[PDB]
Amino acid sequence: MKRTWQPNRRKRAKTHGFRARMRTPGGRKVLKRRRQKGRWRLTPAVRK
Amino acid sequence: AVKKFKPYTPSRRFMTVADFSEITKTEPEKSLVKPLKKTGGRNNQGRITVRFRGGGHKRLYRIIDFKRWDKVGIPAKVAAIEYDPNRSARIALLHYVDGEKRYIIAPDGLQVGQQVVAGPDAPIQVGNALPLRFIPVGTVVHAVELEPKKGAKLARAAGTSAQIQGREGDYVILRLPSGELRKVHGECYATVGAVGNADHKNIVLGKAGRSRWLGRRPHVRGAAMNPVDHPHGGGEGRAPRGRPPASPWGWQTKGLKTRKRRKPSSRFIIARRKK
RNA sequence: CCGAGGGUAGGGCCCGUGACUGGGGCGAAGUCGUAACAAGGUAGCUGUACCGGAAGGUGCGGCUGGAU
RNA sequence: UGGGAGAGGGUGGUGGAAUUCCCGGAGUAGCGGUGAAAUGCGCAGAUACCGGGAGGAACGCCGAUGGCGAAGGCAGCCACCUGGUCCACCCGUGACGCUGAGGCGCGAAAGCGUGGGGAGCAAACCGGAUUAGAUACCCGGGUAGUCCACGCCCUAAACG
RNA sequence: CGAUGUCGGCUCGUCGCAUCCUGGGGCUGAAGAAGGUCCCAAGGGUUGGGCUGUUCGCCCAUUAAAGCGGCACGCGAGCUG
């Protein structure tokens, strides 16, 4: 049946993407935390 | 002259439609239409603030002339009478001798090819707009401004009208469509006649699908819900109200008045509606 | 081929009968009231409507086949 | 052909008297109601009185033992549309007449549908009183209805 | 109670005997036939339907008879629901 993951590149980029995070107090804290933790990717990769 | 149908489906048995007899032009004036942005009942927050709205037929908004003191003394010809889906009244397309074109609400009895005019000395004739002070007592009017130059506010739906009862200083006394007696300032414009399409109220929608066409989504009784949802929610089996009948938000809904007490316009209302 | 009739299926008219039910007729001396006949003690009657244990009452209009 | 009388019918206007309610003024201890009362209303200011307003329904006098219509029925006043009818003259048609099973239309009230309207009145209903009772008669309230439009109903002591 | 699945049915039996029938008896208010009552006896047998979820019970048509109980009210790692 129809499962929950239905990939959509524009959806992915517009929702979790770098510019979405920077636009918002909480999203910037996301970027700030993932930098402090040393994440290699701060944001989900998507082909665009 | 509401039209019936033979019972050739279960729903056609009761359905009635308007006869559309007065309509003479079945496509709108292109320079006068705008896109009418549906809300679904949602506000600028995305939140439903009026329940059970959405899903109706697409409509274009037809701009209407609710001022008419815009063109004092300039007569116009009634070019056509048209269907307007944003309102129960029909609308009349006016060709001013100016060349300008405008829509008004089409009063009852208004004929295509006749002339209307607005102003302090327009004839007292169906379709003409004057300040209220210059309209003789006893006259039936519609599209009544409520305050000078603010736009027609009262008696705009199909069949409705207000009557001029008397005068008092700068104000006239109207009996509104609801039967309330109210003082409206004499410089407020109004239009001789009653609104047309008085048969409108006799239309029998006929089936649930018809309400859906109009953008009306199914209304859920509170008694049909659970207590997380409504004062009337819950109970094993059916249940009477078991408390004073109430809205989803808990306020009482059989009798409880709701007009604000200290509202400044109270000085201008003579008799609240009756019946 | 037609054909007495037999069979299958579905209709129409009539008769009989049926738990129970409706009112009708009748029946020397039952129970309740007293509507009508006198102005019958609220003139009667009337078509209709609503109501009432019951006769009946009341509303609307009509008739005199009503009195003084 | 020339005239006549008439609440004959339909539409639309519009006139005053009265009732009710509302507003203002003035005024105080009751008013109302009956056979007598009581319910009811009234010092939160009624009744009685004056001025204003709103709304519905019915048209006093004239009015009659009257008039009109086929009947049911029709009553302020005005205009318009319209029917029946009578008289004069003796002009025209030339028996073209009578009645009429069916059919069709009309048909008081009450009632029914859908809108409207609602002052007065008032089935139902409530209360007061009377009474052995009083699902009545009398009194205080009062909803349909009574009014308008369209559509039904088609009854009668629709009787001379 | 860190789980012993709980009515009825179906299937499959097996046991007790306070025995429904069949076999053997004594008493009889046992003429005969047919019963009643008690004793001995558990080898075998103990039907098909209507109603109800029903167990049970009533009813129909039969029968030699249409027995009563136990087995976690036998049997859901066998079925049904």
Next chain:
RNA sequence: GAAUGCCGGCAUGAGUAACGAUAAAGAGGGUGAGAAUCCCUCUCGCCGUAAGCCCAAGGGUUCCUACGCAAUGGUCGUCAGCGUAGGGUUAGGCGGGACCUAAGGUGAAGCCGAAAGGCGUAGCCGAAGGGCAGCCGGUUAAUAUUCCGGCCCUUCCCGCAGGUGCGAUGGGGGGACGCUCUAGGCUAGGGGGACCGGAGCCAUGGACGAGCCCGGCCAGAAGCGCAGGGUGGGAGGUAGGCAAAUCCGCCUCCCAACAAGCUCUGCGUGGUGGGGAAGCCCGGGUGACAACCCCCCGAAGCCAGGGAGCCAAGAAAAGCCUCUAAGCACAACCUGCGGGAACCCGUACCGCAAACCGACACAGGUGGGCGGGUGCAAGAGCACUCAGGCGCGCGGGAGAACCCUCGCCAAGGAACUCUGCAAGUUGGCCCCGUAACUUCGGGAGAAGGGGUGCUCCCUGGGGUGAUGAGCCCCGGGGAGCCGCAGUGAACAGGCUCUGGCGACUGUUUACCAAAAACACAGCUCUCUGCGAACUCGUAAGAGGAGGUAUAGGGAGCGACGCUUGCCCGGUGCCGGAAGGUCAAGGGGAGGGGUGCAAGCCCCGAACCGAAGCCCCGGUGAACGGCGGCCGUAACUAUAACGGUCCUAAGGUAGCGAAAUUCCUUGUCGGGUAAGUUCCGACCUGCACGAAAAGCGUAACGACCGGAGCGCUGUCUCGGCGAGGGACCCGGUGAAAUUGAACUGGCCGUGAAGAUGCGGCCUACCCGUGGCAGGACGAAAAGACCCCGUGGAGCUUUACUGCAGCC
């Protein structure tokens, strides 16, 4: 040494289940160390509105070639979507961007909020919508509307020539729109040809034939032809289109009007450029100078912005055309022609799936286009087949039980069972015929019956064409033939009677309930005069609504029919400028602390003083409520009638053992051989009852009862047969569970149900296929139940607050 402890390792179950659709395989020949599994050929089977082909998303080298097989592949592997390496994606015209706007998002102005932030007009962003210029063929191992070839086209820049008041982000036009139905003409696609081209074939009884078999086109600029779309021309006036305007709008006049002209598409033709089969021979060659023609069918596509009808009344903006404004008229714009200029990103491959979403090469899920032929009335249905694609990545045997899916069955025919559950039956089309009831539509495919193939003969009308022929479509009558059987296979209602509930089509507990529940048109009450009420928000601001009482919110009821009674004492709500109570505040009689005093400071009575509450009324489709006892009739019985107590008032019409009735399988009647169910009645209704509506109701229902007919493996009562498993052999090889075990029966005992204790009995050691009585078998720290001064949802006249409102 234990914590259903933690991490890791390794056992048991076990050579056990399984190896993922029952579309299916066999053989020969290659290769290789090794082959059921890789390659080739022949035979067989499966899909074919796909299981084929082309797009979009998503995926991201999986593409092609060489080398290779440790692991991955459910077996094998020489093979592969795997390992290593090399190669491969080419655009002014395809798609997106340098164009437009949609919701929405963002947001100079501006508004709001402790902060973070929230809004917000214009503007900007935003597409699978608008707009915009490329078709056919060839080529590569792998890209192609991209390279090549042929024939077309767009914009930008510059110049030449001609023409014109040129000029815009501003005005106007246009762009520009629904649903259903639909005309004419075409194209796509398809069928046939006794015509044209073709390698060949004659078999096994016959055929050298009007035989068989294969193919018979595609793209094309200008011009031309056919079919369509779009559009009146002139003149005068002019105050409107937020400046101007010759434009547009409005008024008038003349003329034109189912046309025509102009304009723009579609289709046809068209210089020219391509393609071109079977077969035969090693993707290629040949066929081949290939032929490329006629007839018919024919779109849902095209002409298109076409026509008609209808109500629920159907985007925007740019491109484009026109108007003028500053300006400029040595400019500029328009037309034609010529030269130059033309950027960025995508392009491989998978794409109903082994490459996407489901942990897997997973029987699931995934939007658009094409989707051939024949027959069956039609069709995208069904059967078979084309092109193309597959046989589903373990096999080989055997022919037990048992399971699954399937076929048949003597006599019976629901006796099965909670229930005809399940499975039979029926089954398409044509014709005949069809009841109660009804809201007149319906019920209706009611029911029930008849026909159905093939052959010859006669004949009716329509399309194309020509009026005929041919092809094609709908028939009509007569005579025959065969079989058990003619919708001969596949696809395709069993019917009826009668109740309950709900009017109806719809909706729902994703994944145990599809219903009588929700919704529904419709009815009523109620609030709301507009900066409405109400809702979301602290606010600003939104929705309501660019609506205005024939409208909007809330509530109940639930099509329709006939109806909806009595109670306002309590609660609610509505009305009530009196009266009672009433907080802050006003007021300050009169006290007190202190100070030598002036003073400073404190307490404080009457009285004035809102809402609310009290109080007086109203109000039921507001919350709600609608009695008890005793007596009485000339047979008995029962009480129309009476007495009395209480109430705010004592349940009306209608209905009633009911989806409600406890006693209960009430009683009587019907149906049955028999009926706790069903239906009709009665009424002592435990405990119906009138918008939490009452009683009905045609039609409707995968709802729930009861009955009958038809027919059956449901059953008496089972039997046989088929295939997939189970079983055996080769390959690969799990699981929960598990204190250890050398793990029998009885009768007892024991914490009360013992393989493990006692006494007896029985018993050689170890497996394999089976069955499930036990191991109080497994699974899940019982959901029930209780306990915890544990938690959470929900309610209210529990307590106490808060929003909101007064």
Next chain:
RNA sequence: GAGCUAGCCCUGGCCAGGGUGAAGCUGGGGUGAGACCCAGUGGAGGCCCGAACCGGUGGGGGAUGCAAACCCCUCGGAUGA
């Protein structure tokens, strides 16, 4: 976090074939005029049958599954809420 699901907003797309035959319109009849009747035309509808598509009624199978909701048979809707 609304790439699942629920509602709404914007913009597109999809629904083989067959059946029934409303209004209107035309004509005929009818009448003083009418209503109205009949035939033809017409093509309405939360109309009917049935694929795609959307569902999920009953039963069976599956139950360490092909699958953490699947499979087979059967069944509802299919121009509309």
